[model samples]
Target chain A: SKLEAILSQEVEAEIQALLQEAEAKAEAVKREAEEKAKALLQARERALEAQYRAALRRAESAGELLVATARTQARGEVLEEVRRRVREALEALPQKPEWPEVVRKLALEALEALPGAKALVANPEDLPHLEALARERGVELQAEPALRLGVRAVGAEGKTQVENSLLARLDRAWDALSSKVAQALWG
Target chain B: LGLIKSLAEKEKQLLERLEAAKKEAEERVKRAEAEAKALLEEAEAKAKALEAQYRERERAETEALLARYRERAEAEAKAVREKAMARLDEAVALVLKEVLP
Candidate 1:
């Protein structure tokens, strides 16, 4: 009788432990399910909010595009106005402010400064003798920005500023001539 | 008559076992619920921590981008200044030669 009781009690204890484990597992699973559901709900809300934000961004971008277009149009008009003024000013200048003469002066100045050194002159036609001298000094006579007629020589060190254009040429000549006349009369 | 008594005893034993199992299950469920709640709280804390990390990273990245842009602007300004100086030298020379002496 005791042996049978022991066997029965062993089986019952094992079953009880298994059942407890099972119930605990079930409770854990249930909690996990709840958490999963809550996360899913939060994700859904976030997705909806994101979609709304995207829509707002699209609307903002559309407004920005319109503003940018208007700004670009306004800038174009301003540029056109500036161009018109510049053209008018160019037309107003007397004698077209000789670019060739200024270029010639620059090449001559470069030649005088760099005795044996090679000079790179932009206008070969303006400085005929300079070309021969440039060859002797291994100078280059190439059409370059440094030789461009439109550009004025504002100042030069070893190189000379020989220009009579919009900026360098006319402005310098006017200042010098005015200064000289003023000083003579004033003195 | 003896077998009927034995069957009754077995039934009593089964009822006792069932009652004990039910009590144990309830205790296990209570413990499980506590564990699950703790796990959820920990997960929430982790999520909050990650959000803090993302905020910090986003701020750092934005600031770095702006700093890089500022450095680029400064470099461009320096290059423009140097180019303007070089051009000014040429301009002054031309003025002296053609306009002055």
Candidate 2:
């Protein structure tokens, strides 16, 4: 009974006093330490946030630049081919003619255009006309060694070409259509 | 004499237990603070990475849209070029007729 009474008063008071002293010291130290750590953490967090923003801006700019370069490069290469094919087509049409002789007139016009430009008619099987015309003009006309599918004549002016060939038409078609192609592609 | 020695040993054991508990509390606080600090850093890093990813996705989508628009424009241009060429041919033929006539 005496020991129980001592525990309830004297021993309990001593334990409480020790606990209170320890708790007070711990509280003061923990608060000071946590404050310093919190300040450091806050500074670090702000720095990281700023870095993240900068990186985002850079990536956005790079993407824009990539798109612009891609479009410009693609359009530039395509327009050149368009111009060449359109020129070929313009030369292939007859000057002024209806059906029946239209075909012959177109062939003659093509030959005339080619020679004047130092080029060749793209039509095949037209060697007889080509030779006669060339002879009349006091020039040479000979079949090329490389026979292309459909029609394409080979001769001077790097103008040796094929009119009936789908590939030839496509070349001229692309060239003639360059502006629209460029506008559409660039736009 | 026997009882007095027994009481002294018991008091020493109690003091040791109380000291150990106090030390454990201090350690627990240190460990808790360290864990919290680590958690904060991890959260911030994750947030920053996610932000960058979002920006990248947005930029990629914009570029993709531009490409789609370019494709549409090219198709329209081809149609217009064909029409203009057809008209140019007709005009050139009419002019030839007048001069030749």
Candidate 3:
């Protein structure tokens, strides 16, 4: 009985101490695991958030490019259609009642630009309208079947000439005229 | 000698009880470690699933954004074409005036 009392006291005490120590270490291990889980979630979420922002930025860029391409194509199509219509109008201009007067005005402008012109050349269909203007300017009258509804005033012995034909006028003023037409056609 | 033998037996029993208690504590700590490992693995898997879900959401968001822009672009293009047609005659007259007298 005497041995039981004293031996059990210190031995039991040592066992209890080690149990408490092991339990404390186990609690610490669980706590560390919880901390690791929190870090994992936080890191992954942050990375995805960053990627989401970049994806939205890419979308905006792609959208802007699409909008620009579509608008430019549409504008080009409309401009081409308008230009074709204008060219068709010019091709049928001779059938209009005002064509003879327009022919005369064109001949006068050509001679005015080249007053020293040696000849006023025009389409065979337009000789009737330009005959008087050619005589008044002391310019030689000529029938150039290819002239196409206006006069070509030859000067500097034909090395230099003033082309006042309807088709020629289009090429000469295409830049300014096209811009004006486009503005009138759309916003 | 009889007292000595009884005391020796008592000491031996005490030592055996202490060994058993030590083993039980060691087992408890081992089980706790196993549980902590499982807990960590489960949380890691959940975190991966969350990342996958977010990626899917981002993809949908990007697609919706692109569709909206495409709709607006096509609508605006249609308006431009319609306006050009509506003003066709006016534009033609402008060109004729520049080319003619």
Candidate 4:
């Protein structure tokens, strides 16, 4: 009987311990799940913040680039318009009555530049007007079909030459003054 | 007969105590389970609410930013275009000057 009582007491203690163990395990599981959920939420928040910051920066940079591109395109179009205007003006110059005088003045300036030039080349139409100057200077006058409006004078056996053609001067002016035009207007 | 009766009473008491202890343990288990479940549910609810709020705020801000940026871009582009057009006549005059003389 005593043995029976001892066995019963032992069984009771074991049951109590088992119940406590089960309760502890259950609590631990719950705590772990709560911790996991909290961590996940925090991680998601961090990711969202990072994404927002990156998107804002991208928008800012894109806006800057957009403005810059538009300005650059506008500047290019302005230059194109300037070129068109200059070409039109040059084309209209030949229709004026003073066109021959202008050509004569440019030829004289070329002669002045090459003082010892013995050869004067010009377009066929201008050769008649230039004959007297060539005869006076004892210079050879060559009719060059390639010349549109001015003269090319050569001295020292063609080693020294001055080209004061209308097209050449126009081209030089465009190169040297286009940027200045852009600045004066755009700035 | 008296000794037997005493032993029987003691056994009965032990049985009753064991039954009571089992009932208490079961109740404790149920209560703990309920508490744990409640805690988890509350956390989930809070998390869901926070997530919704966070997404709503972010979306609003993003929309505002886009609108602001778009407006600024359009304004700047218009200004640039106007500036270019405004200088057109002067630009044309300068071009003529360069080639004429």
The CA lDDT at B16 in model 1 is: 93
Clashes of 4: 0
lDDT of 4 at B9: 99
Comparison by TM-score, 1 against 3, better one: 3
Tens-digit lDDT track for model 1 on B19-91? 8777777777777777767666766666566556555655565556555555555555455444434333343
Please give the RMSD to the true structure for each candidate, in Å: 14.8, 11.0, 5.9, 7.0
Q: Please name the candidate that would achieve the greatest TM-score relative to the true structure.
A: 3
| Shift in Å, residue A163, candidate 2 | 11
- Candidate 3, residues B14-88, lDDT tens digits: the string is 789878888988987898899889988898888889878877987898899999999989988998898888888
Give the share of true interchain contacts found in each model: 0.06, 0.00, 0.81, 0.30
Choose the strongest candidate by DockQ.
3
Residues forming the 10-long window of minimal summed lDDT in candidate 2 chain A: A94-103
**A-chain TM-score of every model:** 0.41, 0.37, 0.73, 0.69
Cα displacement (angstroms), candidate 3, residue B73, comes to: 3.1
Q: Write the per-residue lDDT of candidate 4 for residues A58-94, one digit (tens) a residue.
A: 7667666766776676666667777777677666776
- Model 3 residue B52 CA deviation in Å: 3.3
Model 1 score (lDDT): 0.52
Question: Cα deviation in Å at residue A164, candidate 3?
Answer: 2.3
* DockQ, model 4, C-alpha based: 0.22
DockQ of each: 0.07, 0.09, 0.49, 0.22
lDDT for each residue of candidate 1 in A53-118, tens digit (9 for 90 to 100): 565555455545555554444433433333344344443432344644444555556555544433
